Amino acid sequence: KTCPFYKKIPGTGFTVDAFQYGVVEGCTAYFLTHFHSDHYAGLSKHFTFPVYCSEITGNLLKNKLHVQEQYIHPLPLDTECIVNGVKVVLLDANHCPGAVMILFYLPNGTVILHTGDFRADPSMERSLLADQKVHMLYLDTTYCSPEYTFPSQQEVIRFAINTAFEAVTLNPHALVVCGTYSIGKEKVFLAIADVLGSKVGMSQEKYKTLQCLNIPEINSLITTDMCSSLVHLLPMMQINFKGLQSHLKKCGGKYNQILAFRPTGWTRIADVIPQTKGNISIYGIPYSEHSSYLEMKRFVQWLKPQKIIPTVNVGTWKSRSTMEKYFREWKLEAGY
Ligand SMILES: CO/N=C(\C(=O)N[C@@H]1C(=O)N2C(C(=O)O)=C(CSc3nc(=O)c(=O)[nH]n3C)CS[C@H]12)c1csc(N)n1
Ligand code: NI
C-alpha cells in the first residue's frame, strides 16, 4: 500500500503515523503520535529515517521495537521546536502515556493541528491551542457518532476502586485481574492496587513496558512477583471464564475469587453488572482514552477549524458520509 493523503501534512515533507508503506517518497521526517500498533506498524531495528515523537514513545521504540537510538528524535512537550525548517509543538493528547497532538505552523501562516489519538478535554481550550487560529484539523474520529457516550475516566475509576475494595475487604482471598493488550489505561490497575495496598503483579514483558513510561515511583507500584500481589495484569485474551478459571489454579490455589476488569461497553455507572460464573466475575468497564461524541463535538466547536480531515473510520463510504454530516451540523450550530 501507499501512504494515504490523511497521513501527509501539506506544504511540508512530514508524515504522521505512516511507517507501514516503506520509504514514503518525499517524506523528510516521520512523526509518531503514540506507541499503539496501528500507528507504529512497520518500525523495527532496520528503520533508517528520523522518527520524531515524545520521550516516552522514544523509550518504547528503543526498548520494545529495538529502533536504533540514532533515528529516535524525542521532543519535549509544550515547546516550540524546529524540525526540517518548520515550527512544531507537541501537546499531551490525553490518550495513553507518551501520546501527543502535533501543531504545525506552516510557512504561509496556516496552522494545522493533528490530534493523533486523543480524548478531548475542556483543559485543551485554555492551553497553547488558544493562542493562535488553527485552520486545519486532522481528527481522531474513533467515536464520532452520538451513541458513544461513556462516563468520565474518574467516574469509571471510582466504580472500579469501590467494587474491588468492597470485594477484597469482604473476602481477603479474592484476586483482582485487569486485562491489557497495549499501553494505556494504567490508572485502572494502579488505582485499584493503591486502594488495596498491593503492588500490581505481571509478566516480565509487561513490567518492561511499564518501566518505559516515566510514571513516578513506578518501582513501588509494580512487580514480577505475582503471588505476592492482589492485583494481576493478564493479556486481554485471557479475560474469559476458561482463562480466569485456569489462572485461579496459580499460586498454589491461594485465591478463591476473581474480579476481573475488561475495558468495553462503549455504545448509570452502577448499572455495570458483571458477567458471572461461580466465583469469577468479569466487569466490562467503559474506560476510554478516546473522545466521546460530545467531547469531540465540544472541542471542534471551540476550535472552529476551516477544514476537518478524519483519521479514523475512513474506510467505508457510509462512515465518511456520516462523519461529514456531523461536522456540517456542528459548524451550522456554532456558526463558523
Ligand atoms: C463484560 O464482559 N465483556 C466481555 C467479556 O469478558 N465477556 C465474558 C467472556 O469471555 N464470557 C463468556 C466466555 O467465557 O465465553 C461468556 C459465555 S457464557 C459461558 N462460557 C463458558 O465458557 C462457560 O464455561 N460458562 N459460561 C456460562 C459470557 S460473556 C463472558 C467482552 C467484551 S468484548 C469481549 N471480547 N469480551
Ligand atoms: Ni491509540
Ligand 1 touching residue 244 (CB < 6 A): no
Task: DSSP letter for 130, please.
Answer: G
Answer whether 216's CB lies under 8 Å from 189's CB: no
Is residue 72 within 8 Å of 56, Cβ to Cβ? no
Q: Which residues contact 264 (CB under 8 A, 6 or more apart)?
A: 284, 285, 286
Which of 152, 54, 25 lies closest to 39, judged by CA? Answer: 54
Cβ atoms of residues 61 and 71 within 8 Å: no
- CA gap 26, 74 in Å, rounded: 22
119/40 Cα distance (integer angstroms): 19
d(CA 46, CA 71): 10
Ligand nearest to the CA of 280: 1
Q: Is the beta carbon of 240 within 6 A of some atom in ligand 1?
A: yes
Cα angle vertex 259, ends 180, 226, to 5°? 60
> Which of 234, 240, 279 is the best mutation target for the ligand 1 pocket, counting ligand atoms within 8 Å of the beta carbon and taking the most?
240
Report the distance separating Cα 320 and Cα 70, nearest Å: 39
**Region class of 109: left (phi > 0), else alpha (psi between -120 and 50), else beta:** left
CB atoms within 5 A of ion ligand 2 belong to: 36, 117
Centroid of ligand 1 to alpha carbon of 316 (angstroms): 30
How far apart, in whole angstroms, are the C-alpha atoms of residue 256 and residue 136? 55
* C-alpha cell recorded at residue 192: 485499584
What is the C-alpha separation between 74 and 53, in angstroms, rounded?
5
Q: Is the CB of 264 under 6 A from ligand 1?
A: yes
Residues 30 and 49: beta-carbon distance below 8 Å: yes
Q: For ligand 1, say whether the CB of 181 is within 6 Å of any of its atoms.
A: no
Nearest CA to ligand 1 atom 2: 284
3-state secondary structure of 313: coil
Domain 149-290 has CATH 3.40.50.10800: no
Phi–psi pair at 146, nearest 5 degrees: -65, -20
Q: Whose CA is nearest to atom 5 of ligand 1?
A: 240
Ligand 1 atom 27: residue of nearest CA: 277
CA–centroid distance, 241 to ligand 1, in Å, is 6
Helix (H, G, I), strand (E, B) or coil at 269: coil
Residue 263 CB partners (closer than 8 Å, separation 6+) = 179, 185, 188, 284, 285, 286, 287, 288
DSSP state of 45: T
- Measured distance CA(163)–CA(141) in Å, rounded: 32
Q: Is 65 helix (H, G, I), strand (E, B) or coil?
A: coil
CA distances from 274 to 19, 199, 258, 260, 271 (A): 39, 24, 11, 9, 9
Q: Whose CA is nearest to atom 8 of ligand 1?
A: 240
Query: How far apart are alpha carbons 53 and 81 in whole angstroms?
Result: 12
Alpha helices, H only, the chain: 37-40, 55-63, 153-170, 186-196, 204-210, 241-247, 293-303, 317-334
Say which ligand is closest to the CA of 273. 1
- The CA R_g of the chain, rounded to the nearest whole Å, is 21
The CA distance from 222 to 4, in Å, is: 40
Ligand nearest to the CA of 140: 2
The secondary structure of residue 26, as a DSSP letter, is: T
Q: Check: CB of residue 185 under 8 Å from CB of residue 240.
A: no
The separation between the first and the last C-alpha atoms of the chain, rounded to the nearest angstrom, is 36
Cell numbers that stand for 170 in this block: 469482604
For the purposes of burial, counting CB atoms within 10 Å of the CB of 297, is it exposed (0-12), middle (13-18) or buried (19 or more)?
A: buried
Helix (H, G, I), strand (E, B) or coil at 218: helix
DSSP 128: G
Q: Which residues contact 255 (CB under 8 A, 6 or more apart)?
A: 173, 174, 175, 248
Which atom from ligand 1 is nearest to the alpha carbon of 243? 14
Instruction: Report the distance separating Cα 322 and Cα 76, nearest Å.
Output: 36
CB of 280 closer than 8 Å to CB of 248: yes
Per-domain boundaries in the chain: 1-148+291-336, 149-290
Cα dist from 313 to 121, 278, 318, 323, whole Å:
21, 39, 10, 9
Closest by CA position to 188, among listed 209, 214, 160: 160
161 Cβ neighbours under 8 A, 6+ residues apart: 191, 192, 195
Helix (H, G, I), strand (E, B) or coil at 170: helix
* Complete edge-to-edge strand list for the sheet that includes strand 8-9: 8-9, 14-16, 29-31, 51-53, 72-74
Supply the residue whose CA is at minimum distance from atom 3 of ligand 1. 284
Q: From ligand 1's centre to the CA of 282, what distance in Å?
A: 8
84's grid cell: 526540517
218: left (phi over 0), alpha (psi -120 to 50) or beta: alpha
Q: Which atom of ligand 1 is nearest to the CA of 277?
A: 27
Q: Among candidates 295, 302, 280, which has minimal Cα distance to 150? A: 295
260 CB within 6 A, ligand 1: no
Distance (Å) from CA 64 to ligand 2 centroid: 17
Cα torsion 177, 295, 56, 214: sign = negative
| SS3 assignment for 180-203 | ECCCCCHHHHHHHHHHHCCCEECC
C-alpha cell at 309: 480531515
Resolution, angstroms, 1 dp = 1.5
Which of 3.40.30.10, 3.40.50.720, 1.10.540.10, 3.60.15.10 would CATH assign to domain 1-148+291-336? 3.60.15.10
Task: Locate 15 and state its grid cell.
Answer: 508524515
Q: Whose CA is nearest to atom 34 of ligand 1?
A: 264
Grid cell 488495596 is found at 196
C-alpha cell belonging to residue 201: 503483579
Distance CA 27, CA 44 (A): 18
Among 236, 241, 279, which is best to mutate for testing ligand 1, by the most ligand atoms less than 8 A from CB? 241
